[PDB]
């Protein structure tokens, strides 16, 4: 669970619980963790298998240190209804070099106000940037660490992935950066659509 929390902090779409598989599957997920799922239960009304059924908020974070400066990343995941699907979950991602911006401060701010007050907190604070949308969050993360998202993917799967069943996949996907020219080839193909239309 903790490793999955880390991977959630890092990646856009991590293979949760990858270790149980051995490297080729994931069967737990973000919302299950947010709601404290533990098993099937009776599956008709039973909330015991789901610890936090009511309006709930979840946060996770970690802090590292290079050259004495510490960077903390965070995230917030809260529901506002009995509804039990991703759409009814509200998001925040967090990215700070200021050590004073701890998960406790961020959780306090959320308690003090919803998404709007978190935006105001970002406005007020320095060394802190937070994003309800993960694209910008991981973009800033990646131009900060100077390693592509591919790196983080390899990191996650590397946590497990003891097989190395065959090298071809491991390298081509997990290891090697991607610049296959599908988009460029489409671009070329599309320039010819004009001629095709006069032909038709």
């Amino acid at each position: 669970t903790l490793v999955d929390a880390l991977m959630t902090l890092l990646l856009a779409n991590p293979r949760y619980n990858l270790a149980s598989t051995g490297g080729h599957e994931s069967d737990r997920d973000l919302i299950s963790y947010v709601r404290g799922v533990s098993g099937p239960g009776d599956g008709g009304e039973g909330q015991s298998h789901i610890a936090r059924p009511g309006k709930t908020v979840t946060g996770i974070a970690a802090t590292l240190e290079r050259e004495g400066k510490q960077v903390r990343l965070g995230a917030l995941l809260w529901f506002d209804s009995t509804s039990s699907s991703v759409t009814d979950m509200k998001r925040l991602w967090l990215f700070s070099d200021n050590p004073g911006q701890t998960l406790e401060h961020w959780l306090n701010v959320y308690h003090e106000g919803g998404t709007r007050l978190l935006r105001q907190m970002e406005k007020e604070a320095i060394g802190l940037w937070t994003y309800p949308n993960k694209k910008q969050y991981l973009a800033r993360l990646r131009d900060f660490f100077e390693v592509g998202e591919n790196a983080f993917t390899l990191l996650n799967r590397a946590a497990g992935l003891k097989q190395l069943n065959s090298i071809d996949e491991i390298f081509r996907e997990l290891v090697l950066d991607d610049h296959s020219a599908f988009d460029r080839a489409a671009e070329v193909a599309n320039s010819f659509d004009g001629l095709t239309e006069i032909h038709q």
Partner: protein, 49 residues
């Protein structure tokens, strides 16, 4: 019947007219215009490009 087939193939102006003798004159006008104005210039542009 063939006027209706012409409309079935039609793509442009032929909708103005139906499937009767009075529509025939316009059919002929369009056939001439296709053969003379349209087809050669379309071929010009197509092959040129």
């Amino acid at each position: 019947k063939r006027m209706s087939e012409a409309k079935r193939v039609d793509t442009g102006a032929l909708v103005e007219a139906g499937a009767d003798l009075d529509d025939i004159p316009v059919y002929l006008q369009r056939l001439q215009e296709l053969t003379e104005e349209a087809l050669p210039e379309k071929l010009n542009r197509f092959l040129d490009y």
